[PDB]
Design an enzyme around this catalytic site. Structure first.
Site, PDB file in Angstrom:
ATOM      1  N   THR D   1      56.612 -31.015 -42.294  1.00 13.82           N
ATOM      2  CA  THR D   1      56.620 -32.113 -41.294  1.00 13.82           C
ATOM      3  C   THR D   1      55.936 -31.684 -40.013  1.00 13.82           C
ATOM      4  O   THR D   1      55.838 -30.482 -39.722  1.00 13.82           O
ATOM      5  CB  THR D   1      58.045 -32.515 -40.943  1.00 13.82           C
ATOM      6  N   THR D   2      55.417 -32.663 -39.277  1.00 18.41           N
ATOM      7  CA  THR D   2      54.822 -32.374 -37.988  1.00 18.41           C
ATOM      8  C   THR D   2      55.111 -33.587 -37.134  1.00 18.41           C
ATOM      9  O   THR D   2      54.654 -34.682 -37.442  1.00 18.41           O
ATOM     10  CB  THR D   2      53.302 -32.160 -38.032  1.00 18.41           C
TER      11      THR D   2
END
Ligand SMILES: [Mg+2]
Ligand SMILES: [Mg+2]
Ligand SMILES: [Mg+2]
Ligand SMILES: [Mg+2]
Ligand SMILES: [Mg+2]
Ligand SMILES: [Mg+2]
Ligand SMILES: [Mg+2]
Ligand SMILES: [Mg+2]
Lengths: 244, 233, 245, 202, 220, 250, 238, 204
Positions: D1-2
């Protein structure tokens, strides 16, 4: 029977020889104690809330004086009777409603909210430790495919939906009025519904009030969000009724 | 901060009577009348829903409630007390199904709810339910009709009535009808036994009826009601 | 109206005519107390109390009827002091928990609604008795301005511009209406608070007395503080002199 | 995730990828990692899907009641606090990396970070999630004070694009959202719309 | 197990193999994996059979109790909420992987719920050991607004991919179609697996089994 | 609170529990019920009160309850209260069966339910149950036995007894016309219809105005049955169609 | 009498009789006096003996190094409150390693004793208290009553015929603040004597003294130890 | 493993208007036999039997506690438990111990109390049920048992060709399992009678 009494049937919520609950009854008179009256009408495309706003003092921030509460953004209500009890019941309604959405995924139906508050009060009616609340609750908002809804619940456990209704001192006078105008019932538009509500209150109180002597709450099929009318736009309706 | 009353509010008098229970029944005998008929091929429930005070929205609330897919109810007495028992019966109905995987036998649902009603005649701080119920169901071929009152006692009826003029409404049926009555037949003799007291213009919104055949339980619409009303249908 | 045949022993009992005498009785306790007043100036709220001299043996500051419920909220009370003090602890606790949970100073309207519901809780059962007290909550902030609330034994809560509780609830009001607080500054109201106190105070019956003044507004920097002795004296002199007229 | 959030004058910009994996298998390549907490408050989620979802519903419930009770728009700082309270209190049983950004009639646009530990801190712009490690240097050399709802909205698009490029745990589509007094506008950047950078050759 | 669901133009389609295994041995060649929630809501279950049962039964039961009071028809978000909040509460110990699908007043809804309690709102999903195989079918041949039959078979094709490519899946392909006005619970929908025709005879002829004790008892 | 509590579990100046005595009163108004002990069986006969031409009655009985597999009982008093004490009776039976893997000794199932009623009179502030019960059964310790219980939490084993309406005229009658040691299930059923015909404001004691059940041994397994309509009347007529034959002797 | 037996019952006059009745318990107790200079807090009390062969009742108790008290009313309630007071102090030292500010301790008695006056079935504490202590705000003399109310005093006295003592104290207040110990104690002993029947006065057998101050930790004096203070009395107005 | 501590095998088969259920008789603790007459099949009403395999203590306990419930059910309801319902009853009792389950996988065999309907099913130690139209197995030789069953079972069978079929499945499966055996017992239930035979088998 015929008004008989035995034991403490007049002090705690237990049956009387007739099979009545005096405390529940004494609880209704308790409503009128506030000396106010409230009316709610169901339009074809909306629902309306109207009540007195007796503010005999100039030392009160009239802003903080209300009987109109926002439960949800799509559910508004009007309380009639003992104040503290009322705020209380309002808080429970807010709670039961916020909780319903968290637990179920969708806004609580005006139908359900009232049935809920009603069920709660029923307990005070069967349990002796506490007295019932001396207040009445009227909720309004727009349902998914049922359009506008208007519900009221008792200090006795009863609850129901109406085309229109009232509560307070002039409840019985307000019903006779409304039910008589619901037969002649023209086109129940937003304006008429609002107009019919104001007059019902004005004629039963015979007052022709200023814009500060009443408060009006409304929910609209085109604007489901509960809305409390400004003093300004309240008068806009008052003037409109004077043109005749 | 609340505590609680742990002493029972119902107690034997010297006459041996349980005062609060009698008085509860008095609240019943004073409620809108209800009739139930076991048509040896189904059952019918009907009561006087005379609210419609021109402003009351007859729709929003019902007195004939579905408990399970095959059970149904009606009462005579205090409306709010009823509602409580409806939620408890429906609940009791599920706790049975989860365990057994078979819909709850009508006699069994009655026994369970009756136990509750009995509970409120001995537990502390409470008054008996001011209501009487008529449960109808189709469990294992045979149709069933029961009545449980405040005391928590129940009985199975071929047909009966409770509420105002329940005395007259019973005697009337005590002859004005009998077994072998088919479906629509028992429905007519039921709406009739109702009118045997129903003061006013008994329309399709002044009453509410439900039927329970060996194919589920349901409430009849204002339509099917307006029909049977015309002294037939 | 002499109603009271068992109908006045429990808060969980309604009178045949819809009243809860225990709560009404609790209010009497308040009506018998010494007068306290609150007035919303334009830059804060000011509090004054007619703290009667119970005995000359008591220190000046004993039985204070004004407390800090939070650093930005003041509480003025009337009635059964011990009941009031516990309400002050509840107010404090409520205001403290709020900061811990939501992370910012509690809004006076909320602190008032909260405490009010607690008060109300005590008017429904036989298990407990209604608080025999009334109190006002005053605060100031730039994002909220000045706010004045008053709660009574029934739980009811409302916002005011000016208000009084006690022996002379009525007499104090007719005197407050003479001021136009909405435009007045707090530094000038002190005088008027002390003024309305001496007027209302009964020189006859109630013997000697002391004056308690509370501070909260732009003049205090939002912190509810006691009024500086200097301002108090000036306000006492002004009140006494204005009395000789 | 970012995940990432940036503060600009009258509002905030929020961005996240759409990848949610279990091991190396993408169970959802179209996840919506920007969750609405209130009318003008949002949070970006990274960590245990079950944990971040459960926590967000809880805060939304908490905040919705708080505002109706006050009859007022809730503070962004409050929403952050409610996350911080649950994330600190249950820090041993949660795996949530949260960023809360939104608009406040009283404080304007704001962004708060509430990482693993349960701490809470306000920042000009915040980044979280696995992929965040690959865009620190970038973000540090690119962030400019005084950017516009446009420069910002583009700045996160690049950062998320870069990060999605290097992190296996990140990818899919870039979701954005800008919040300011006026309201909230959410857009998405599929395939080509996603900034690109030529892979070094001969 | 291979369970999947797709969202098409008029509603939803749910698929599911029918194999149940106790280790690496097939215990049930025909397990029913598509469970009934409400009349407009169905759920496929993968994982710990017992858990998939009871959780699915409970939410169903709780929704029959719910709509029995609101008088309206159950919504999908509600089943989704109830399910996810319970599973989450058990931090993954209730091994239930679900594919929830149904039609609302708000339309057809397809959610995927994991044992730890997170959910995914998607047009097509898969769960179970055969989920990767099935998901391939979808990713390769999926179109929005497919017609009943155009989906009704994309799903039986993905449940098929699972059946053959995953030792944890086999037997029949069950289906479930739910549209704004219909509910087709196609139990055997396909049956691409048949037990090979017995090539010999073994019928045990009366008397072959030596007995040591006998005892009868007449009923009525 | 102190004001509304009736003190259902307190002593009276006499030294008696008034709420127990008032429950009794209620009992002495309920459908008469009795049981007699033979040597080949034991029985129960009760005044069917749910007598009316509209009831659909779908039960094995109306006042006869199967507890154990070797036991059954009947009640006199508040039926709901009774449904509660029987349910608990069945549970106490099974708990014993689970724990020991053998049917619970008859008397023991009684002392059990009695300790519970006894409690409702010593503490709790609750009203006692308005019920008195007759227990009949068989157990490898005393074979056939008949027991009686009061809402006081009191009990005793009777070779013969009655409870309910005119539960005084019924006693004395049996108290003299009872074959102490020489009773057959037949000579038992004898006094049954004889005494019920008496204490029961009914002429020609119809088959409905009564409910009969008998418990007997039978090649191992105990047998519990309630006589069918016909089987009842046989003893109905037998009583009278022998009584007119009894005045041809005077 | 419908309004006399439960502290949860308000009377139609806005009073709570149970509370008032408990206050009566204080009046019954033998009189006690308290006063402070600007450097010392002093408690003085008259002890009673059931019969001549019995000892005189304790009236002064040690709470903590900087606090002591005198009691009037139910003895059992005094011990409850004393132990609460002692506990609260031990906690302060444990957590903060500093003595519990006397005024804060008083607020706790106030909160603690208020609770039972508002709950059904509970009763007010049946004891009054004079509290003598010394914190970083100097000497202090507080008073606490069965009604959770409490007072900060310049001097005070509760008990039987304490009205005389109060009167004497009110007359010589201005003197107190600058008195040196022995003089302060005398004023106390003198005030106590006011509450006695003219035909009798202070004995080393019926007087008890409690002193705490900037220079001394709370200390009690009971028999021969009281002589030093009784010497140098005053005529005693005939 | 816990399940194979006492060893054991149980099986149920479906005929035309009959049903069969058999079980080994060995009661051992690891390698050692302790008893040859160990009951593993229990009567739960006429035409309804339950067979319990697995850990000896829970076998006995699950059975005793199930009887407890079965009896009351029959005293409250005015009937005799229907197979599909007894199955749901055991499914509930086992799952109430979901996180500390009884170590036994039950087998139910019987005929409808008010119909011909033959019925067989088996369960998880945690209560998941399985109903089939052919057979069901449980115990330490599930594999051996499936072997026989998939090669000896025929759709419709008269009581005698069912007895000879289920008797062969057992004895042969149980003879390739070291902790199952010491004799087999069979129960064949017909609307009219209950035939109970203890087959002749190996005692090693
Ligand atoms: Mg009550
Ligand atoms: Mg009715
Ligand atoms: Mg109130
Ligand atoms: Mg003035
Ligand atoms: Mg101020
Ligand atoms: Mg059998
Ligand atoms: Mg072997
Ligand atoms: Mg061997």
């Amino acid at each position: 029977s015929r008004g008989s009494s035995a034991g403490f049937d007049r002090h705690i919520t237990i049956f009387s020889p007739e099979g009545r609950l005096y405390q529940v009854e004494y609880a209704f008179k308790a409503i009128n104690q506030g000396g106010l009256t409230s009316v709610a009408v169901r339009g074809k495309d909306c629902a309306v809330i109207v009540t007195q706003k007796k503010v005999p003092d100039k030392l009160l921030d009239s802003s903080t004086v209300t009987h109109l509460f926002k439960i949800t953004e799509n559910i508004g209500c009007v309380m009639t009777g003992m104040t503290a009890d009322s705020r209380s019941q309002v808080q429970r309604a807010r709670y039961e409603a916020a909780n319903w959405k968290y637990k179920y995924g969708y806004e609580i139906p005006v139908d359900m909210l009232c049935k809920r508050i009603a069920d709660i009060s029923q307990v005070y009616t069967q349990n002796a430790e506490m007295r019932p609340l001396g207040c009445c609750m009227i909720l309004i908002g727009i349902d998914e495919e049922q359009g506008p809804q208007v519900y009221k619940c008792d200090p006795a456990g009863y609850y129901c939906g109406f085309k229109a209704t009232a509560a307070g001192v002039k409840q019985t006078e307000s019903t006779s009025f409304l039910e008589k105008k619901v037969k002649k019932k023209f086109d129940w538009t937003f304006e008429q519904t609002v107009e019919t509500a104001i007059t019902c209150l004005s004629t039963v109180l015979s007052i022709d009030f200023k814009p500060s002597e009443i408060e009006v709450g409304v929910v609209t099929v085109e604007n489901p969000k509960f809305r409390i009318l400004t003093e300004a736009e309240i008068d806009a309706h008052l003037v409109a009724l004077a043109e005749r | 901060a609340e505590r609680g009353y742990s002493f029972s509010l119902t107690t034997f008098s010297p006459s041996g009577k349980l005062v609060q229970i009698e008085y509860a029944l008095a609240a019943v005998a004073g409620g809108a009348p209800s009739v139930g008929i076991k048509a040896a091929n189904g059952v019918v429930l009907a009561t006087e829903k005379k609210q419609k005070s021109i402003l009351y929205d007859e729709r929003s609330v019902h007195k004939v409630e579905p408990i399970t897919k095959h059970i149904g109810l009606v009462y005579s007495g205090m409306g709010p007390d009823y509602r409580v028992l409806v939620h408890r019966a429906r609940k009791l109905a599920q706790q049975y199904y989860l365990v057994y995987q078979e819909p709850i036998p009508t006699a069994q649902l009655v026994q369970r709810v009756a136990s509750v009603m009995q509970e409120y005649t001995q537990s502390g701080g409470v008054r008996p339910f001011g209501v009487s119920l008529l449960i109808c169901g189709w469990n294992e071929g045979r149709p069933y009709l029961f009545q449980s009152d405040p005391s928590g006692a129940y009985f199975a009826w071929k047909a009966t009535a409770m509420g105002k003029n329940y005395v007259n409404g019973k005697t009337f049926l005590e002859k004005r009808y009998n077994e072998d009555l088919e479906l629509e037949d028992a429905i007519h003799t039921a709406i009739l036994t109702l009118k045997e007291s129903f003061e006013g213009q008994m329309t399709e919104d002044n009453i509410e009826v439900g039927i329970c055949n060996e194919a589920g339980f349901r409430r009849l619409t204002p339509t099917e009601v307006k029909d049977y009303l015309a002294a037939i249908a | 109206s002499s109603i009271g045949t068992g109908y006045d022993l429990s808060a969980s009992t309604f009178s045949p005519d819809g009243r809860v005498f225990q709560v009404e009785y609790a209010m009497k306790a308040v009506e018998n107390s010494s007068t306290a007043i609150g007035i919303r100036c334009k830059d804060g709220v000011v509090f004054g109390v007619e703290k009667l001299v119970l005995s000359k043996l008591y220190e000046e500051g004993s039985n204070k009827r004004l407390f800090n419920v939070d650093r930005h909220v003041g509480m003025a009370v009337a009635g059964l002091l011990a009941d009031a003090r516990s309400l002050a602890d509840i107010a404090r606790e409520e205001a403290s928990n709020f900061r811990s949970n939501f992370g910012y100073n509690i809004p006076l309207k909320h602190l008032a609604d909260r405490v009010a519901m607690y008060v109300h809780a005590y008017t429904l059962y036989s298990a407990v008795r209604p608080f025999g007290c009334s109190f006002m909550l005053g605060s100031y902030s730039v994002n909220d301005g000045a706010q004045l609330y008053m709660i009574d034994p029934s739980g009811v809560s409302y916002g005011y511009w000016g208000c009084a509780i006690g022996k002379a609830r009525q007499a104090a009001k007719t005197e407050i209406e003479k001021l136009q607080m909405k435009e007045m500054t707090c530094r000038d109201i002190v005088k008027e608070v002390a003024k309305i106190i001496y007027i209302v105070h009964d020189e006859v019956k109630d013997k000697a007395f002391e004056l308690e003044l509370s501070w909260v507004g732009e003049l205090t920097n939002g912190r509810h503080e006691i009024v500086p002795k200097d301002i108090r004296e000036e306000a006492e002199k002004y009140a006494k002199e204005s009395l000789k007229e | 995730t970012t995940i990432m959030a940036v503060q600009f004058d009258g509002g905030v910009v929020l961005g996240a990828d759409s990848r949610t994996t279990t091991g190396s298998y993408i169970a959802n390549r179209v996840t919506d990692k920007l969750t609405p907490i209130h009318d003008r408050i949002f949070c970006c989620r990274s960590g245990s899907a079950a944990d971040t979802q459960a926590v967000a519903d809880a805060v939304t419930y908490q905040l919705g009641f708080h505002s109706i009770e006050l009859n007022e728009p809730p503070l962004v700082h409050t929403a952050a606090s409610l996350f911080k309270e649950m994330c600190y209190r249950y820090r041993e049983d949660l795996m949530a990396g949260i960023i809360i950004a939104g608009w406040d009639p009283q404080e304007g646009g704001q962004v708060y970070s509430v990482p693993m530990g349960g701490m809470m801190v306000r920042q000009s712009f915040a980044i979280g999630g696995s992929g965040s490690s690959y865009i620190y240097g970038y973000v540090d050399a690119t962030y400019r004070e005084g950017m516009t709802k446009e420069e910002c909205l583009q700045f996160t698009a690049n950062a998320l694009a870069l990060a999605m490029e290097r992190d296996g745990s990140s990818g899919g589509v870039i979701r954005l959202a800008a919040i300011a007094e006026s309201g909230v506008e959410r857009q998405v950047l599929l395939g080509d719309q996603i900034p690109k950078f030529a892979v070094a050759t001969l | 197990t291979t369970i999947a669901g797709v969202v098409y133009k008029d509603g939803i389609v749910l698929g599911a193999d029918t194999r149940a295994t106790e280790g690496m041995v097939v215990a049930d060649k025909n397990c029913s994996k598509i469970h009934f929630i409400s009349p407009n809501i169905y759920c496929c279950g993968a994982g710990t059979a017992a858990d998939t049962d009871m959780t699915t039964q409970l939410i169903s039961s709780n929704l029959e109790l719910h709509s029995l009071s609101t008088g309206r028809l159950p919504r999908v978000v509600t089943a989704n909420r109830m399910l996810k909040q319970m599973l989450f509460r058990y931090r993954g110990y209730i091994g239930a992987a679900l594919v929830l699908g149904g039609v609302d007043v708000t339309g057809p809804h397809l959610y995927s719920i994991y044992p730890h309690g997170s959910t995914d709102k998607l047009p097509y999903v898969t769960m179970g050991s055969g989920s990767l195989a099935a998901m391939a079918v979808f990713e390769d041949k999926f179109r929005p607004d497919m017609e009943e039959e155009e989906a009704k078979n994309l799903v039986s094709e993905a449940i098929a991919a699972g059946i053959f490519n995953d030792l944890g899946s086999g037997s029949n392909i069950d289906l479930c179609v739910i549209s704004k006005n219909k509910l087709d619970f196609l139990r055997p929908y396909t049956v691409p697996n048949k037990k090979g025709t017995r090539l010999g005879r073994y019928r045990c002829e009366k008397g072959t089994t030596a007995v040591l004790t006998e005892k009868i008892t007449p009923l009525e | 609170s102190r004001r509304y509590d009736s003190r259902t579990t307190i002593f009276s100046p006499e030294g008696r529990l008034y709420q127990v005595e008032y429950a009794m009163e209620a009992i002495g108004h309920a459908g008469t019920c009795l049981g007699i002990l033979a040597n080949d069986g034991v029985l129960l006969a009760a005044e069917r009160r749910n007598i009316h031409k509209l009831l659909d009655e779908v039960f094995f009985s109306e006042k006869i309850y199967k507890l154990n597999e070797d036991m059954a009982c009947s009640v006199a008093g508040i039926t709901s209260d009774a449904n509660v004490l029987t349910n608990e009776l069945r549970l106490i039976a099974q708990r014993y069966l689970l724990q020991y893997q053998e049917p619970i000794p008859c008397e023991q199932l009684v002392t059990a339910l009695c300790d519970i009623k006894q409690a409702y009179t010593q503490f709790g502030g609750k009203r006692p149950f308005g019920v008195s019960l007759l227990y009949i059964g068989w157990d490898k310790h005393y074979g056939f036995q008949l027991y009686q219980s009061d809402p006081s939490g009191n009990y005793g084993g009777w070779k013969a007894t009655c409870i309910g309406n005119n539960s005084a005229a019924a006693v004395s009658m049996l108290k003299q016309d009872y074959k102490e040691g020489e009773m057959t299930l037949k000579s038992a059923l004898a006094l049954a219809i004889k005494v019920l015909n008496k204490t029961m404001d009914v002429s020609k004691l119809s088959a409905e105005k009564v409910e009969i059940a008998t418990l007997t041994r039978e090649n191992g397994k105990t047998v519990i049955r309630v006589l069918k309509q016909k089987e009842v009347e046989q003893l109905i007529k037998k009583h009278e169609e022998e009584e007119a034959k009894a005045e041809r002797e005077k | 009498n419908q309004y006399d037996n439960d502290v949860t019952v308000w009377s139609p006059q806005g009073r709570i009789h149970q509370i008032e009745y408990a206050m009566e318990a204080v009046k019954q107790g033998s009189a006690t006096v308290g006063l402070k200079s600007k450097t010392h807090a002093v408690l003085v009390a008259l002890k009673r003996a059931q019969s001549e062969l019995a000892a005189h009742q304790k009236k002064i108790l040690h709470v903590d190094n900087h606090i002591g008290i005198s009691i009037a009313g139910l003895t059992a309630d005094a011990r409850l409150l004393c132990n609460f007071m002692r506990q609260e102090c031990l906690d302060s030292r444990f957590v903060f390693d500093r003595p519990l500010p006397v005024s804060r301790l008083v607020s706790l008695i106030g909160s603690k004793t208020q609770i039972p006056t508002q709950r059904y079935g509970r009763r007010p504490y049946g004891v009054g208290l004079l509290i003598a202590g010394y914190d970083d705000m100097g000497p202090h003399i507080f008073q606490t009553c069965p009604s959770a109310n409490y007072f900060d005093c310049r001097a005070m006295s509760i008990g039987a015929r304490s009205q005389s003592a109060r009167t004497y104290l009110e007359r010589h207040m201005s003197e107190f603040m600058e008195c040196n110990l022995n003089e302060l104690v005398k004023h106390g002993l003198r005030a106590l004597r006011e509450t006695l029947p003219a035909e009798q006065d202070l004995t080393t057998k019926n007087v008890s003294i409690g002193i705490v101050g900037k220079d001394l930790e709370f200390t009690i004096y009971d028999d021969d130890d009281v002589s030093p203070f009784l010497e140098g009395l005053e005529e005693r107005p005939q | 493993s816990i399940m194979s501590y006492n060893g054991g095998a149980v099986m149920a088969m479906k005929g035309k208007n009959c049903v069969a259920i058999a079980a080994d008789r060995r009661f051992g603790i690891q390698a050692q036999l302790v008893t040859t007459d160990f009951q593993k099949i229990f009567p739960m009403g006429d035409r309804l039997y339950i067979g319990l395999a697995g850990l000896a203590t829970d076998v006995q306990t699950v059975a005793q506690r199930l009887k407890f419930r079965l009896n009351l059910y029959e005293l409250k309801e005015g009937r005799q438990i229907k197979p599909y319902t007894l199955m749901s009853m055991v499914a509930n009792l086992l799952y109430e111990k979901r996180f500390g389950p009884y170590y036994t996988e039950p087998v139910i065999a019987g005929l409808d109390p008010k119909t011909f309907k033959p019925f067989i099913c088996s369960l998880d130690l945690i209560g998941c049920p399985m109903v089939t139209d052919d057979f069901v197995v449980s115990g330490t030789c599930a594999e051996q048992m499936y072997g026989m069953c998939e090669s000896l079972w025929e759709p419709n069978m008269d009581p005698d060709h069912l007895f000879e079929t289920i008797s062969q499945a057992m004895l042969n499966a149980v003879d390739r399992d070291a902790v199952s055996g010491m004799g087999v017992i069979v129960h064949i239930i017909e609307k009219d009678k209950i035939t109970t035979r203890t087959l002749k088998a190996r005692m090693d």
